[PDB]
Design an enzyme around this catalytic site. Structure first.
Site, PDB file in Angstrom:
ATOM      1  CD1 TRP B 133      -2.810   1.370   0.344  1.00 54.31           C
ATOM      2  CD2 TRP B 133      -2.318   1.755   2.491  1.00 54.31           C
ATOM      3  NE1 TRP B 133      -3.693   2.312   0.813  1.00 54.31           N
ATOM      4  CE2 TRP B 133      -3.408   2.572   2.129  1.00 54.31           C
ATOM      5  CE3 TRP B 133      -1.831   1.822   3.799  1.00 54.31           C
ATOM      6  CZ2 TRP B 133      -4.017   3.453   3.025  1.00 54.31           C
ATOM      7  CZ3 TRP B 133      -2.439   2.705   4.694  1.00 54.31           C
ATOM      8  CH2 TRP B 133      -3.523   3.501   4.300  1.00 54.31           C
ATOM      9  CG  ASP B 214      -2.588  -2.947   6.755  1.00 54.83           C
ATOM     10  OD1 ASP B 214      -3.812  -3.153   6.849  1.00 54.83           O
ATOM     11  OD2 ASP B 214      -2.116  -1.942   6.165  1.00 54.83           O
ATOM     12  CE  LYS B 249      -9.948  -0.321   2.177  1.00 53.92           C
ATOM     13  NZ  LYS B 249      -8.503  -0.467   2.490  1.00 53.92           N
TER      14      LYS B 249
END
Ligand code: PLP
Ligand code: PLP
EC number: 2.6.1.1
Lengths: 399, 399
Positions: B133, B214, B249
């Site tokens: 990311w 993460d 999400k």
């Protein structure tokens, strides 16, 4: 291998927020919470405003997505914030000299300013009042900025020690940040007069300070426009300033984390360039701000009908606190205090430096179940007709 | 006095969020957004989940106060987070070895972890996969930590280069942090197998690394429990680890900023001591987290009927993406690609590396109004039966 977490030194509890944990644990009946700066109504509750509930209903009915806000948040929220701070028709607005980021509370606004300054400017030093909100030092230190204190409060006369304030800022240099509370100084409740604000504005310009206003109580001193007079005197004179503002207290939206960081520069090109680096500092922290609380505020401020309800709700809060200040002074006398507490009537906002010592504050907690901050700060907005007599009998007992 | 902001240089645009701004301004009606990682439904909307709307209706009619949450947020949100991550009955939970703070998104959880590590331990370096990311480097650098890259993706075979990964990580020392994506690697969609996770867990304890997960896509690869197998294999062996997770999400709650930072230590005493400094670092950032989004999550997970609706909505999202991956591959062949894209079927989550060059990605934007990230990452969840044909015609035209 040795653990990474083994050499860690414990942190003490927060001097304000740790009070909630202590208060919650106390099983003495009749305990009284005068600690954290929440507004309580006449029955001892912390209510949701009616205007907020109406706005939340409108959002539930009309929101069709939760997709991410931009880094700087809701555009309408920023515009309404600038009008509230600077006034409709302000030259700062017409000249496009101001940019606003929606942030997670006034706390988040202060941290975003700190990270921005530390990474993109030569600012090394921030001057805060003695006393101030205890978290000011922590926020600026977290970005590696030195925090110095300036004199503010005359603890003998219970007034602003303006001579000592001026003298103690003599060594603040050009390019240093000087932090001012916009109104309702936390914890003293003592604010500059308009003339004193004007004197400070001319001095800051002549010494080259970068002013930073912490504006968490707009509307709690005299009114929305009146409470911004000092900020606006600075804004009429300065090329640059930063405002960290909060809607936690004046909308009763504490836990939704609604605030704003406003950057002002000499012209539109400069503030846009600076604001791009402020957005980058946000992206590396929490990325984008929480929608719900700021949507509520933007809805209320941009609807004439809801705004009129909110303004009356804010007036009612302000007026109840003022009544409690008077009742507190009268009941202390009734209950036998020989110390004169009439200075409390002259202080603005939710608090009042009571003059109690740390030993007296601890005794109040341990012997009487009355919770204040160890500095002697008491939340007047936590006082009610029902708890006033017992909390005054307790104070009189420790004097 | 020369202004403090005069010499600031403008920041570059964010590689993801800057593209969202360009997309919004683009006036062409056929434009297609395959950039930022949002879930779209089959009609090209970004909806609010039904489970979320029902929870919000319950909150509207039952919330009586907005008083501040604790620094670490809603207690039930933390408990439910730990169960989702480690599973009911985990020894980590029964041994009281984990503490969770509610944070503003996964982003906020990453910065809190970074600040905590930088200010309270000897950690100096964080190892991140190449690629990762884009915002990982910014978060860790802004907290003062060095970021190093380990090999991950084989671009010729579109697979995990596991031998290269292990070889590159032999340069990581004891006390370094190594960052893993729990599932649905961003941007490649290539995750370790369970066997490979177990090999990495064993190597990690042997080498003395501090694992940081993460976890932003739990539920989008195979399932809620299955997607946590890799994390739980680490949790079985390690004394210490950190999990930064996101509900943006898998609840479609992007703009309410709902995440968690979970600390694990060797025992209850050590984790409580370390968590006290985590709370101090939160206090000096945004003070306390926003309630609305986390309240929604806690309400859904703590209610059997709402949880069942949510799990079915998440399954539907996961299966819709899987259908688009297959349709994308088949449609490319019909439109004339003459190039094997079957590796798209083997990748998990929203994102795949398409293999397109930056020049091709630029052509797609400028000539065809199709927006992808310059790395070639495409958001498969942005594809629909209605935009698939024009998308694929555009891609074939730039090959
Ligand atoms: C309440 C307060 C803040 C923080 O405001 P939040 O919106 O709760 O983060 C900052 N400064 C002062 C002086 C305050 O009283
Ligand atoms: C989305 C994402 C994040 C950020 O999560 P937010 O909840 O939106 O702050 C962090 N890491 C990865 C890999 C992500 O995909």
């Amino acid at each position: 291998h040795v653990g990474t977490f083994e050499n860690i030194t414990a942190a003490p509890a927060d001097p304000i927020l740790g009070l909630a944990d202590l208060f919650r644990a106390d099983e003495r009946p009749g305990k009284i919470n005068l600690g954290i700066g929440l507004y309580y109504d006449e029955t001892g509750k912390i209510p949701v405003l009616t205007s907020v509930k109406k706005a939340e209903q409108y959002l539930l009915e009309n929101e069709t997505t939760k997709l991410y806000l931009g880094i700087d948040g809701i555009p309408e929220f920023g515009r309404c914030t600038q009008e509230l701070l600077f006034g409709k028709g302000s030259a700062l607005i017409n000249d496009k000299r101001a940019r606003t980021a929606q942030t997670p509370g006034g706390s988040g606004a202060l941290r975003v300013a700190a990270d921005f300054l530390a990474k993109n400017t030569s600012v090394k030093r921030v001057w805060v009042s003695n006393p101030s909100w205890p978290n000011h030092k922590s926020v600026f230190n977290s970005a590696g900025l030195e925090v110095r204190e300036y004199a503010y409060y005359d603890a003998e006369n219970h007034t602003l020690d303006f001579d000592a304030l001026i003298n103690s800022l003599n060594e603040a240099q050009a390019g240093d940040v000087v932090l001012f509370h916009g109104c309702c100084h936390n914890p003293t409740g003592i604010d500059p007069t308009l003339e004193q604000w004007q004197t400070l504005a001319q001095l800051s310009v002549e010494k080259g300070w970068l002013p930073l206003f912490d504006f968490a109580y707009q509307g709690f001193a005299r009114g929305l426009e009146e409470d911004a007079e000092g900020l606006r005197a600075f804004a009429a004179m300065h090329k640059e300033l930063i405002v960290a503002s909060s809607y936690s207290k004046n909308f009763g939206l504490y836990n939704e984390r609604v605030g704003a960081c406003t950057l002002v520069a000499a012209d539109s090109e400069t503030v846009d360039r600076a604001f791009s680096q402020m957005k980058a500092a946000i992206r590396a922290n929490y990325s984008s701000p929480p929608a719900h609380g700021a949507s509520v505020v933007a809805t209320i401020l941009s609807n004439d009908a809801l705004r009129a309800i909110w303004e009356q709700e804010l007036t009612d809060m302000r007026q109840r606190i003022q009544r409690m200040r008077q009742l507190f002074v009268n009941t202390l006398q009734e209950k036998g205090a020989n110390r004169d507490f009439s200075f409390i009537i002259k202080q603005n906002g939710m608090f009042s430096f009571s003059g109690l010592t740390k030993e007296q504050v601890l005794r109040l907690r341990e012997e009487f179940g009355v919770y204040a901050v160890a500095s002697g700060r008491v939340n007047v907005a936590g006082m009610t007709p029902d708890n006033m007599a017992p909390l005054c009998e307790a104070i009189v007992a420790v004097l």
